[PDB]
Write an enzyme that holds these catalytic residues in place. Structure first.
Site, short mmCIF file in Angstrom:
data_model
loop_
_atom_site.label_atom_id
_atom_site.label_comp_id
_atom_site.label_asym_id
_atom_site.label_seq_id
_atom_site.Cartn_x
_atom_site.Cartn_y
_atom_site.Cartn_z
N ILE A 10 26.05 16.90 64.48
CA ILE A 10 26.17 17.99 64.35
C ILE A 10 26.03 18.71 65.69
O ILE A 10 26.40 20.06 65.97
CB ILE A 10 25.11 18.72 63.16
CG1 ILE A 10 25.34 17.82 62.12
CG2 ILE A 10 25.20 19.94 63.05
CD1 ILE A 10 24.50 18.36 60.86
N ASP A 86 27.00 27.44 60.60
CA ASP A 86 25.78 28.39 61.05
C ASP A 86 26.52 29.68 61.34
O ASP A 86 27.79 29.83 61.32
CB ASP A 86 25.14 27.82 62.46
CG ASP A 86 26.25 27.56 63.55
OD1 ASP A 86 26.64 26.56 64.15
OD2 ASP A 86 26.59 28.82 64.31
N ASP A 127 12.10 31.76 67.52
CA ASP A 127 13.13 31.54 68.14
C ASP A 127 14.41 31.64 67.45
O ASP A 127 15.22 31.04 67.29
CB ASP A 127 12.97 29.90 68.80
CG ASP A 127 14.12 29.54 69.79
OD1 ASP A 127 14.79 30.32 70.32
OD2 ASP A 127 14.35 28.24 69.78
C1 ZIP Z 1 22.52 21.44 66.64
C2 ZIP Z 1 22.65 22.69 66.10
C3 ZIP Z 1 22.37 23.96 66.96
C4 ZIP Z 1 23.48 22.86 64.89
C5 ZIP Z 1 23.01 23.60 63.46
N1 ZIP Z 1 21.78 22.78 62.59
C6 ZIP Z 1 22.33 22.31 61.20
N2 ZIP Z 1 23.26 22.14 60.71
C7 ZIP Z 1 23.77 21.74 59.50
N3 ZIP Z 1 22.63 21.39 58.74
C8 ZIP Z 1 21.36 21.67 58.95
N4 ZIP Z 1 20.08 21.42 58.30
C9 ZIP Z 1 19.25 21.97 59.23
N5 ZIP Z 1 19.68 22.16 60.26
C10 ZIP Z 1 20.91 22.15 60.32
#
Ligand code: ZIP
Length: 298
Positions: A10, A86, A127
């Site tokens: 990811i 995100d 953060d």
């Molecule tokens: C590496 C990053 C900055 C990406 C987003 N992180 C995540 N992306 C997707 N599922 C998740 N569950 C916990 N954290 C998660």
């Protein structure tokens, strides 16, 4: 790890690589985070283990759930519930039309609920940034990596040699205050709020001093009148240029009066004057809040 089948990378976070992985036993897709590359010589402090274990108990519908903690072979893997997108990606994807106000208001409201919950248990994120704000197809938004900075003291150049963003860092942190409060998280959220509205980062500094001077040019150089005790801060310098405060109507157009009023309270210099998550939920800005469905194609 071996009880999981990685299905993807990811990305690369602050602490290590984040993988989409399928739990072989359960069959549930989860977010697996291998913690701290290279810099881990000791055997993983019992202290981080204990802080982390406490987080397993902090559950709220707007907090990304910490499913499991795996200290195996003297390594640590945190297993989190998985969310497909995100807020950074979503904003980039809404670059031309912008994210609608109703959506912005719902997301801010839910964020303040997760924050008020963590803050009531004396837990800080410290953060906050678009990258760790995750969204789903139902209209929800959740805070990722809450409380980890306290466990693993946040660095700038990650294991991937990447430079950690300072754009959401509160001024008390930048001025050397080491006993920061829940107010730091409210400052970050104020910055993310302004970014969602204008579609441009509020304070894109590229160095600690550049970050601080960009805050000053916009909000005015802080003094003892607006922030008592500022001149006694560790990194405060009497030689800082004195800039005047700009009008928020110029800073965050076309946000209305309620939103600007809320934002200015989220952006108070003095950490003690800054609005709390709890009080913010009661602001007039949220009187007509709804929960609309976002626009996302996975
Ligand atoms: C590496 C990053 C900055 C990406 C987003 N992180 C995540 N992306 C997707 N599922 C998740 N569950 C916990 N954290 C998660």
């Amino acid at each position: 790890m071996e009880n999981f089948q990685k299905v993807e990378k990811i990305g690369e976070g602050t602490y290590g690589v984040v993988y989409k992985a399928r739990n072989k036993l359960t069959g549930e897709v989860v977010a697996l985070k291998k913690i701290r590359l290279d810099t881990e010589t000791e055997g993983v402090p019992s202290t981080a283990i204990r802080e982390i274990s406490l987080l397993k108990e902090l559950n709220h519908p707007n907090i990304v759930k910490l499913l499991d903690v795996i200290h195996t072979e003297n390594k640590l893997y945190l297993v989190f519930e998985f969310l497909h997108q995100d807020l950074k990606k979503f904003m980039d994807a809404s670059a031309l039309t912008g994210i609608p106000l109703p959506l912005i208001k719902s997301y801010l409201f839910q964020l303040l609920q997760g924050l008020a919950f963590c803050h009531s248990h004396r837990v800080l994120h410290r953060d906050l940034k678009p990258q760790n704000l995750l969204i789903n197809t139902e209209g929800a938004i959740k805070l990722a990596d809450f409380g980890l900075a306290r466990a693993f003291g946040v660095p700038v150049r990650t294991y991937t040699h990447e430079v950690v963003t300072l754009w959401y860092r509160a001024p008390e942190i930048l001025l050397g205050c080491k006993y920061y409060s829940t107010a730091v998280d409210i400052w970050s959220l104020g910055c993310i709020f302004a970014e969602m509205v204008t579609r441009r980062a509020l304070f894109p500094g590229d160095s600690e001093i550049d970050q601080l001077f960009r805050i000053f040019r916009t909000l005015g150089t802080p003094d003892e009148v607006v922030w008592p005790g500022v001149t006694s801060m560790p990194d405060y310098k009497p030689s800082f240029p004195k800039w005047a405060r700009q009008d928020f109507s110029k800073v965050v157009p076309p946000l209305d009066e309620d939103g600007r009023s809320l934002l200015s309270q989220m952006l108070h210099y003095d950490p003690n004057k800054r609005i709390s998550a709890k009080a913010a939920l009661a602001h007039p800005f949220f009187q007509d809040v709804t929960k609309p469905v976002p626009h996302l194609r996975l």
